[PDB]
């Protein structure tokens, strides 16, 4: 088992994961648009 402090750190990460769930679904639009803008410069 890892040290006790380490397990406590995982709990802090879990809180962020809960919010990330809803954000991840919304995060799909920005990610798609960003990738496209870079590809155009590469083709040029």
């Amino acid at each position: 088992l890892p040290s006790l402090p380490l397990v406590q750190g995982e709990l802090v990460g879990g809180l962020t994961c809960l919010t990330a769930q809803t954000h991840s679904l919304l995060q799909h639009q920005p990610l798609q648009l960003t990738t496209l803008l870079d590809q155009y410069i590469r083709e040029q």
Partner: protein
């Protein structure tokens, strides 16, 4: 607000079988 407050009442009421599929379901559809 009058919108996010109701967002909660749905999740807590969802059955376990529902919730599991939802994360895969919407991600697979809106991506």
């Amino acid at each position: 607000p009058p919108k996010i407050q109701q967002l909660v009442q749905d999740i807590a009421s969802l059955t376990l079988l529902e919730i599991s599929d939802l994360n895969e379901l919407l991600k697979k559809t809106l991506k």
